[PDB]
Paper text:
Rotaviruses are the leading etiologic agent of viral gastroenteritis in infants and young children worldwide and are responsible for an estimated 140,000 deaths each year in developing countries. Diverse interactions between histo-blood group antigens (HBGAs) and rotavirus have been described and it is believed that HBGAs expressed on the surface of target cells serve as viral receptors. The distal VP8* portion (~27 kDa, N-terminal) of the rotavirus spike protein [name] from P, P, P and P genotypes recognize the secretor HBGAs. To understand the molecular basis of LNB and H1 recognition and binding to P VP8* we determined the crystal structure of the clinical isolate Pc VP8* in its apo form and bound to LNB and H1 glycans.
Two different crystalline forms of Pc VP8* in its apo form were obtained. The first form, VP8*-Apo1, diffracts at 1.35 Å resolution and presents a single copy of Pc VP8* in the crystal asymmetric unit (ASU) while the second form, VP8*-Apo2, diffracts to 1.5 Å and presents two copies in the ASU. The three copies of Pc VP8* in these two crystalline forms present the galectin fold with two twisted β-sheets separated by a superficial cleft that conforms the glycan binding site in P and P genotypes. Superimposition of the individual VP8* protomers from these crystals showed that the three molecules of Pc VP8* are almost identical (RMSD 0.28 Å for the superposition of all the Cα). Furthermore, Pc VP8* are also structurally identical (RMSDs 0.37–0.57 Å) to the VP8* apo forms of the linage I PWa and PRotarix, supporting that the glycan binding site is preformed in the Pc VP8* protein.
Residue numbers in the entry: 4 to 162
């Protein structure tokens, strides 16, 4: 576990988990290669009714209807696969640790989803993995993929 590091924009190598300590609602990260992959994660505070909210992602002011009906936080993965398609809520991570993870490896993006403490990983395909950069809005850490067991622990139970 290396970090914490301050909010920034960069392109991580493959084979490292980025573990973001989300401490603000709104946009947690923005990741794209500008060709076939866009994901922005949006943090939602507990006990929220279906309310529309504005989110400036990839320089675009977007509107999403969100609703977190769980003592836990909700992290929604907004995805689109072309610049012209609408974002959709592809995956959600419900957690009380407020940690979000992203890994680039094997040519596909890996993230955690489901509900803590039993969130697990899932993958997304791309034709240009190397080009996917990330703007991180919160203090984050880096953990090698060889220590994924620890990343999983952190995701589901905290630092």
């Amino acid at each position: 576990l290396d970090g914490p590091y301050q909010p920034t924009t960069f392109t991580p190598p493959s084979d490292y988990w980025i573990l973001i300590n989300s401490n603000t609602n709104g946009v947690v990260y923005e990741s794209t290669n500008n060709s076939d992959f866009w994901t922005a994660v949006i943090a939602v505070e507990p006990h929220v009714d279906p309310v529309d909210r504005q989110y400036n992602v990839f320089g675009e002011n977007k509107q999403f209807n969100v609703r977190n009906d769980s003592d836990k936080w909700k992290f929604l993965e907004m995805f689109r696969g072309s610049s012209q398609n609408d974002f959709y809520n592809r995956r959600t991570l419900t957690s009380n640790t407020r940690l979000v993870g992203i890994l680039k490896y094997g040519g596909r993006i890996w993230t955690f989803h489901g509900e803590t403490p039993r969130a697990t990983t899932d993958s997304s395909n791309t034709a240009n993995l190397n080009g996917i950069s990330i703007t991180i809005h919160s203090e984050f850490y880096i953990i090698p993929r060889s220590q994924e067991s620890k990343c999983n622990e952190y995701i589901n139970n905290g630092l």
